[PDB]
Structure 1
Amino acid sequence: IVGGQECKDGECPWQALLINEENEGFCGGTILSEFYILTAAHCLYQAKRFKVRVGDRNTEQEEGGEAVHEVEVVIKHNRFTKETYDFDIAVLRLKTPITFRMNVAPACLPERDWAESTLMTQKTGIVSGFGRTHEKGRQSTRLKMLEVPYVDRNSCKLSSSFIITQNMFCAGYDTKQEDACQGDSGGPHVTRFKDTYFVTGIVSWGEGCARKGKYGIYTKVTAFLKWIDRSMKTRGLPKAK
């Protein structure tokens, strides 16, 4: 994350980190329940073997809490096109449930319409992650948070060099250099409504981290809400809708 702040204990508890074969993290995720995590389908391709870790705020340290879970079944949207990062969502089903606890809580899933009218019309959303920190935040493995305002589709579609389908939405500053960067992908983009936080996006991609004129684009969770829901009931592979 470029120039945001860190998460105080308790502050960003629905954050999951995905680690690969050498216990290095590559993408992030959001905890939805004791069994499911949400991440960005592309992450499936940045490592060959990965696990999910929760309750951690410093990639090169163990403070306690820090649990590692294995995956059991993973649903990737079967309309994920590696070339467009369209339909960039996957839900993981773990093998052993999460013991929610200090610094480990889920994020809420809003209900479509309400989400549309209230969260998505808020002025900002907040994103978090453990990846690339190009700014002034001593150490490099801490968990950060950054508040990104929402951008309007016209100005999004007119900035990006590639397409913005209706499942992507843009957020970030236009000149300020604070943004989701490499290693935050998959990670949560959550909107706060009266002291409660619901997930509004999954970090998907960007054209560099904090490049002036570019914003970061996230998956439109509100366009996958029912998909997610079914996915949390089944235990299969890709599925659609």
Structure 2
Amino acid sequence: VVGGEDAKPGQFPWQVVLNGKVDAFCGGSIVNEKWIVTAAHCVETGVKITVVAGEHNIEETEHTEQKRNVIRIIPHHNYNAAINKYNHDIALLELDEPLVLNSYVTPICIADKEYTNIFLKFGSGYVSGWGRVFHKGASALVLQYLRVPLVDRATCLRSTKFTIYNNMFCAGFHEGGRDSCQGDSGGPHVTEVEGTSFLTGIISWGEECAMKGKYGIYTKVSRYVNWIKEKTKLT
């Protein structure tokens, strides 16, 4: 995240980090004690993934962290990386052993399809992650967060040469300087509803972080609510 601020401990207790050959290569969000939602392009190669919940400073071993191994990866059934690495860019990760829910490890709420879309229409969400803090710059150590406004569709289409389908939205600032960045993909875009946060998007991609005239591109969660609820149901 470029142009964000340090989270306080437990401010985004649904955030997770994904670690592999490099650390903090992507983010994710806690659906429940056994399931994480992320971007499918983060987990396409099927290589080993470590999920860390309750993380704050990725270079300090603290006490709220809960590390778990990923036992199964469920990319959305319509994801096909051979055609388009960023369409239907959403996946579910099953953990080996359940997270212990607490003030630092808390699920994100997921509304039905209609209300997830109403909440995105509020026009302002929060993104968070350990991605780069400048374009081509260093990764964050302390979790970063940023409020991003929804950008109208026509403005976003003109901002990029790549195609933006109706299952994606754009968010960010016309002046630049504030955006998601590489390493944040897969993390949450959430909308606060009277003090309860709901998942409205998955951080997906962009071309040049925080460059004036460019925006972050996100997956609309509303289209995938039913599939999340079905795949992650524990009862």
Under a length normalisation based on structure 1, what TM-score does the superposition of the two structures give?
0.90
Indicate whether 1:28 and 2:27 are aligned. Answer: yes
Alignment-derived partner of residue 151 in structure 2: 151
Alignment-derived partner of residue 59 in structure 1: 58
Rounded Cα–Cα distance in structure 1 between residues aligned with 2:45 and 2:15: 19
Relative to structure 2, which stretch is displaced further, 190-199 or 97-106?
Answer: 97-106
The answer to whether the 8 A contact 2:74-2:91 is kept is: yes
Alignment-derived partner of residue 181 in structure 1: 181
Alignment-derived partner of residue 210 in structure 1: 210
Alignment-derived partner of residue 5 in structure 2: 5
Structure 1: where are the runs of 5+ without partners?
A: 235-241
SS in 2 for 1:231: helix
| Distance 1:43-1:224 versus aligned 2 partners, 3 A rule | same
Alignment-derived partner of residue 43 in structure 1: 42
| Distance 1:59-1:155 versus aligned 2 partners, 3 A rule | same
Shift of 1:114: 2.0
SS in 2 for 1:147: strand
Shift of 1:233: 3.6
Q: Per-residue CA shift, 1:176-235, capped at 9, x if unaligned? A: 31110011000111001111100001110001111111110111100111111122149x
Shift of 1:48: 2.5
Alignment-derived partner of residue 115 in structure 2: 114
Rounded Cα–Cα distance in structure 2 between residues aligned with 1:161 and 1:141: 33
Rounded Cα–Cα distance in structure 2 between residues aligned with 1:84 and 1:72: 23
Shift of 1:32: 1.0
Alignment-derived partner of residue 90 in structure 2: 89
SS in 1 for 2:159: coil
Shift of 1:2: 0.4
The answer to whether the 8 A contact 1:9-1:102 is kept is: no
Identity of aligned residues (%): 43
Q: Per-residue CA shift, 1:75-113, capped at 9, x if unaligned? A: 101322333510000011111111112321111001111
Structure 2: where are the runs of 5+ without partners?
A: none
- Residues 124-139 of structure 1: matches in 2 within 5 Å? 124-134=124-134
The answer to whether the 8 A contact 2:10-2:54 is kept is: no
Relative to structure 2, which stretch is displaced further, 143-152 or 81-90?
Answer: 81-90
Rounded Cα–Cα distance in structure 2 between residues aligned with 1:197 and 1:165: 25
SS in 2 for 1:110: coil
Rounded Cα–Cα distance in structure 2 between residues aligned with 1:174 and 1:223: 27
What's the RMSD between the two structures over aligned residues? 1.9
Q: Per-residue CA shift, 1:5-60, capped at 9, x if unaligned? A: 111122111000001046x2210000011011000000014783211011111111
SS in 2 for 1:81: coil
Relative to structure 2, which stretch is displaced further, 67-76 or 151-160?
Answer: 151-160
Q: Figure out how many residues of one structure are paired with residues of the other and give that number.
A: 230
The answer to whether the 8 A contact 1:80-1:86 is kept is: yes
SS in 1 for 2:128: strand
Q: Which amino acid aligns with 2:177?
A: Q
Under a length normalisation based on structure 2, what TM-score does the superposition of the two structures give?
0.92
